[PDB]
Amino acid sequence: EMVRKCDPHIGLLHRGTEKLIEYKTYLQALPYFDRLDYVSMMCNEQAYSLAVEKLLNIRPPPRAQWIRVLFGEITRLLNHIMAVTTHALDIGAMTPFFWMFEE
Amino acid sequence: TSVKPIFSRDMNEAKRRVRELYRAWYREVPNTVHLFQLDISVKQGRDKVREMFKKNAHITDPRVVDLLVIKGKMELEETIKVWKQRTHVMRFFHETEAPRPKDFLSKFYVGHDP
Amino acid sequence: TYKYVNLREPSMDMKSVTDRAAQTLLWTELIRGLGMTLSYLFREPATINYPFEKGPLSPRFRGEHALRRYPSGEERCIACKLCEAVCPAQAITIEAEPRADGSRRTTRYDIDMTKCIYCGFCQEACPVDAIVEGPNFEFSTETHEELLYNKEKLLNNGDKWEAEIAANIQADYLYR
Amino acid sequence: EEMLTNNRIWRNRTVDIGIVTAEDALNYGFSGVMLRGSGIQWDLRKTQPYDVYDQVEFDVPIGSRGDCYDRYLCRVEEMRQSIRIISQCLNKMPPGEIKVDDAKVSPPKRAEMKTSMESLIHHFKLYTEGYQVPPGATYTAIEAPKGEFGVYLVSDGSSRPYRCKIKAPGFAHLAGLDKMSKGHMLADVVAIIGTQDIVFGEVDR
Amino acid sequence: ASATRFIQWLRNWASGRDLQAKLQLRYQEISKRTQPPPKLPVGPSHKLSNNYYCTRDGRREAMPPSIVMSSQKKAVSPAPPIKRWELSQDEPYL
Amino acid sequence: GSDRSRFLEGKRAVEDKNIGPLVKTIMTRCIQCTRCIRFASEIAGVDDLGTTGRGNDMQVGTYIEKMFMSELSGNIIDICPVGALTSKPYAFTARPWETRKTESIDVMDAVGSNIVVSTRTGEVMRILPRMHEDINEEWISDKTR
Amino acid sequence: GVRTSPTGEKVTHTGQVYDDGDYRKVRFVGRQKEVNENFAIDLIAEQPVSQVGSRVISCDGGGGALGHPRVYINLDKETKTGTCGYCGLQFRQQH
Amino acid sequence: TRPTVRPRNDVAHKQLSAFGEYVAEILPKYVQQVQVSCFNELEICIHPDGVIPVLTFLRDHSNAQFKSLADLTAVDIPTRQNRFEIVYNLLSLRFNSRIRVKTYTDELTPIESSVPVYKAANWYEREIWDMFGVFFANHPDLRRILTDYGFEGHPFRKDFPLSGYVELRYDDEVKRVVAEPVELAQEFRKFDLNSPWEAFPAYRQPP
Amino acid sequence: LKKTTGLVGLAVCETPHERLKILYTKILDVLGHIPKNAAYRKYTEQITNEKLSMVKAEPDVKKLEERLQGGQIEEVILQAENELSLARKMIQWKPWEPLVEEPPASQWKWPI
Amino acid sequence: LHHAVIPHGKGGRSSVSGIVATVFGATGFLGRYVVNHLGRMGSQVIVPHRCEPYDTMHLRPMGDLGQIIFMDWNGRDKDSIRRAVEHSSVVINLVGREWETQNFDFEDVFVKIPQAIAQVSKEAGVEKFIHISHLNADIKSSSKYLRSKAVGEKEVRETFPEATIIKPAEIFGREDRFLNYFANIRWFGGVPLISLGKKTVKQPVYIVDVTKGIINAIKDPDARGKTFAFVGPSRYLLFDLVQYVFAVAHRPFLPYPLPHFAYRWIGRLFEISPFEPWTTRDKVERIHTTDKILPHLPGLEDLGVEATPLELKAIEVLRRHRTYRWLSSEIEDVQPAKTIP
Amino acid sequence: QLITVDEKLDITTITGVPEEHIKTRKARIFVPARNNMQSGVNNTKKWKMEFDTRERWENPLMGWASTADPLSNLVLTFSTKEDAVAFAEKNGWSYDVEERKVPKPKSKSYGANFSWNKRTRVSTK
Amino acid sequence: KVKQDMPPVGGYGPIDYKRNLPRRGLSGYSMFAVGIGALLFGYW
């Protein structure tokens, strides 16, 4: 059971997202970012939005910026619950997954 | 006309890489058929290998030959390590595709494609 | 500012050392963990009794699509194709022509529900509130073909669900 | 934390498992907790802040051993800091509009769209052609929950991106799995996969 | 909320916490599912005068990149060295 | 233009006018550019279009009931910058972004006018002119169109 | 309204119906053809014409910002009624 | 401070320009162009022969210290005789700065593998080979990474069709998944969106 | 003396002042073989001498770390080793030489 | 042609082949290959089924969306037959059973049912009709299965004179009851053969050859009103064929002669099973019937099909019958059986 | 070190395209004509490469437009005709080039509208 | 007047976030002493 080499073969969920985006408007491409790290949906949206706002040379209003941080940190809670509890589930501790997935 | 080479400096050097690849594929076919439990014979597998090398016989650019050999080595590695599955090996034989006759009349009857 | 999550030095006074020996031999911190799961055994479970009980939703919920009408019964859709243009999935297909009375109306309006990503862009784009995503989410089918909606299906959805859809739009249209 | 943090079985499965050095983590392209677990003091919310992250107070958890256990402790403390940020966002939420008051980028309100000629034109054009973006290219990154998430976005002046490379933090992390698993057993590889916090929607795209 | 006193005591003791002050099941402290209508504010560009678009057009201020060198004194770094972080005074050690 | 409106009044409304079965007129959309008038006079050699009234009530049309049936009449659909003049046969059938443009040649006569064939989903939707200075300039005949 | 072809297949509000000898009607065998019975062309015709006292009237479809974009309709012709291009409501100027 | 307009940071623009010519002075053998965008991103355009010298200098030099390779990608521009632009995005933690290094290549010209400089570059180069067909010399293990086994072509090239050339299904006769020429029940609908009116005069090209 | 640098795998150095003096002096020696007018030599000698000045005039490690602004003194030692490795590599590359080749006409033009 | 049945596309899954086929008996061995080949090219297939819908699931992936339509039918009910055929251009009859049940006997499935399908098809205007008979059908046969094949074959031709009738030999394939039948005998020790299999000659035909022949009959205007005999390219003694089966499967072969009357008694024993009998008296008879030689009928070559030798495909069928020790043996490890010249 | 390769550039064997979509296709290199419905000329700046149109047919289920042509939507943009031609040759496509059509310069005179003796006098404004 | 989702006038009440694992249990001496006491009673 000693691991002599790990060879991760990926692409089993490769869906040409980056080629598909070239056929979309900037609005139409936004939902593709929900489905990248599909546990941190709104954080992915924010990264794409900041990139487009930078090329546009426009600024979002302060209330939107506060909503983005608020829901970015709610999303960070979503991600870390999934990260920690599924990590614990793999190691054999199945019960934190259930308590925390209610949250 | 002065370009950076990939591996071979000229077609004479390139053809040597091709021959070594052909040997590697030729030797491997008996293993592929046995390991993947294919229902084709070693002769069919080796005929197919010959068919794939023949389609590129007209290349006279050493860089293009070098890239064809690089891909040939990658394809061989996928087969030897059973990264490929039986479906990937059998894709070379297009078993489920019906013949498309190449004569003018046969195309004419079926559609507008030339 | 930063903090250290794991940079602490255990004390070496005989009481602390024995406290740790008792922990190692009597399994005190493992017993403590048993206490937590025991407390959960006596907590009321969070399970709801589906399908007799339903998870809470809001007026903005994006569910099954429906084509709406005006109070007179005329269709709201005037075949502008904005929903078709914006659809990220190219799930919408539209054809249109002058109706027998001259009206600008569709002769085809299909949504491939297996292409759709239930994003709601179509209802944002619609200038007349014709295409909406209703509140229904319980419409799974036994065949793929049953999820290729044409105009008749979508209009029937609107007539079926208009009572709920109109109330949901009433609650949220001031945020739009 | 009562279930895991001081549990000896949990510690045996995570302590000194998948140790990565601060130098290797940087050269292998790690980010997020995969850097901070090894002591590197880096967080884009602090060093390259975006939106209003420069207006909230929080602490960055830092590891010392660079192993799975320290990365587990970092993520747990990061959750506590998230709550601390959320508290400030609730108290300091300001009034005002929620999208840029520029109808060549953000669509008008529906009531304006149905009354004003300019608003109807801009609504029509934004939802069909979309806004054009001045030509250029940007690499923009944020401190995503899984690490640094970035896009290299190329505009050619039209309303559709010319190229969009997505930088997924888990891509570089998973590429380091073989390095991190050296000298470990099969059940440790299971733990090491979880400590990297990999989602293949972003790794594969 | 409906647990008997002895059961509340038992699970309070087992967990070491007072679980009744922070129940994970929601009761009546949550918002009503029907709310009064909103009246949302407008943005800074909602004006009848002194509001010409050409004075508030971010896209038309974007410029092509400045060419610093093309192929057609003290050393510098890309920015000043980063300041060292300070330990948290909220809780420096976990 | 600007991105919003400060007009707080009621708009003008104009009645529509029949000028034949080829060109539909929704004259409330007219912006009084007079391109149609100039084209009819100068290109088609027809002095039937004009302006009546004055001020804000100025109206483009024929005053009396008259059809604009010149062999070149369909070209006023192209040069009208707005939807005031549109094609009756094409009405409501397509949107511009969704059409594919095939650049081709007209065969209805021997002039060889250059055209664009607009198709969508395997169907021909309309015929537009294609600029060729030495042949048809930017016009086509009604039979071509 | 919803008519039936000689084969018995309902004709839709778009005029669709499979002709005899069209195999595609096999898809309805043992099942049904979904047809919406409320024909909008019939429903709108039932609305009464609204009499107004001005040469120009505006229509937003009703319900304020829940209707359609507001348009203004000219009522100078007595040979016909003004019709809203969004919702089909008809208007007339009285005397 | 107009509320809807992105503010300008002139201090960064000056700092990145200064460092831009600092790099050009030190590596004149390779640097072809240096530019700073209006949102303060510095790009270094180099001859491909300088991939290792330039990247090594940026990583190791005491006034650079770009220790992290954030991203390594490619862009396909068919109108150029060297259609592929290779883009390195690097991060400096010491100086809290980013820099972009760009080079070029064509279908038959290899680029030096930068794995010796950044171990992160291993998989990024495999992706570039897989999606664009750019060969990286001296790569420890160059093979496809994202596409299916035996996949033919390089999908991220502009002239590779969106839906490819082959599709898969299960065939009961041969009791396996087979690949066949692609037919779509609904063809993708190409939209022509660009307005025929210029949007940004600042970027107008000379006639 | 530091118990830990805080960075995993970076050992604490017992004699950082002498180690820094060795490394900077080695860096200066290697630069001697670079041409005088090469910008890499002029810039690296300038910044290398500043650090050597600060090490000589500051005996306290903590106060020296504050002056250097390079993080832990072990981080500064590592950077000196990295700079020394780069200087040796620069000698074979010779990047001070003129540009090897101009790009094609529109290689860097964007948008196309 | 009605405009909806004009061929379009390039002959793939999403194309329009113009064929609208009702396939009776599509849920069996032959049907799954016929439905697969029709769906490959974008035909409309009506699959009337008597069985549980679970047992039609393997058919569903075979067509593009909307191209496989399932219907309930009863062989005795003529309305249920009419509903399944009245939109079709060709009707294919593959109904058959190798044993009699309490409810259906050989007469019901090989005479009454095929005649009803042909009669209703003719009344409904169906243009093409393909009916599967049997190479060895004979009114003067000891096998009631083959006797009924002869009666029903005459009835179909009389009811639907323009029908194409196909008479295949025993068909071998993955799901066959031929090579799999012999291979499964190993469970009883030795292999009992009447007269030690020296007095029987068989000419088995590959399943895909029969399928391709059926598909080409639909598209061939010359096939209307004809009778074809689908036979494999080589004839074998029954003993040699069974010996070859056990060689490919690497199972020990112990052939012993069993008299005809003893084999019949054994057949009656297995018939008592209320499920699918392992063997029957009639099955024993057919397996020991020499495969007829019919030079006057057209064959697979006349429909553009080159018959596949049994040697190229036996391993495709018989590999699953080997033990782990022999699973990986290759196609060339066994020598072909002696073929009668 | 550079080697001398004097052959023409032909990447047809390493692009992975099927043979039927190299030799049977006809590329068209052109500058798109101005859409006559609008006066803007910004969509007439660059060269385009497109391929011959092939069959589309109605889907039997929905009536959608089906295609078996993988190049049906493929459009490439080029700065100049020479760039487009070089791209077509190295990929093995036969091509048709069409010259850019530039509007002819015109003599515009507002004063001609009121000519004393010419036919350019307008009868209305 | 403007009405939108806003915090209450004085703000929200304080929100805990810091780790809290209460200190429980007897000392090592007491626990071992009870263990030996049980053993001696068992042996007797």
Ligand SMILES: CCCCCCCCCCCCCCCCCC(=O)OC[C@H](COP(=O)(O)OCCN)OC(=O)CCCCCCCCCCCCCCCCC
């Ligand atoms: C008069 C003179 C008298 C002389 C005689 C005196 C004798 C008494 C004094 C001797 C000490 C008494 C305690 C001995 C019990 C065994 C203690 C033990 O073995 O624990 C150590 C073991 C290892 O712990 P670890 O920290 O991982 O490693 C140590 C460092 N190498 O730790 C573990 O075992 C961890 C076990 C993990 C799995 C636990 C899962 C279940 C936990 C809950 C069980 C609760 C116990 C219930 C028992 C029910 C009994 C029916």
Ligand SMILES: NC(=O)C1=CN([C@@H]2O[C@H](COP(=O)(O)OP(=O)(O)OC[C@H]3O[C@@H](n4cnc5c(N)ncnc54)[C@H](OP(=O)(O)O)[C@@H]3O)[C@@H](O)[C@H]2O)C=CC1
């Ligand atoms: N070796 C061979 O296989 C040969 C076969 N043939 C003939 O080819 C045809 C099919 O062969 P094969 O497919 O192997 O036979 P199968 O037994 O494999 O399939 C028989 C089909 O007929 C249907 N069927 C049987 N009895 C009835 C009934 N009473 N009512 C309704 N449907 C019924 C079955 O449906 P269900 O699944 O619902 O029972 C099944 O779909 C038969 O006519 C057979 O005689 C000819 C020569 C040789």
Ligand code: SF4
């Ligand atoms: S919800 Fe989104 S994907 Fe679905 S039809 Fe509407 S716009 Fe298209």
Ligand code: SF4
């Ligand atoms: S956006 Fe609304 S009105 Fe326009 S086509 Fe879609 S549903 Fe009809």
Ligand code: SF4
């Ligand atoms: S061309 Fe159109 S907008 Fe101009 S005057 Fe004529 S109708 Fe009005």
Ligand code: SF4
């Ligand atoms: S599309 Fe143009 S002409 Fe038509 S209503 Fe809108 S702005 Fe007016």
Ligand SMILES: [K+]
């Ligand atoms: K017009």
Ligand SMILES: [Zn+2]
């Ligand atoms: Zn209206």
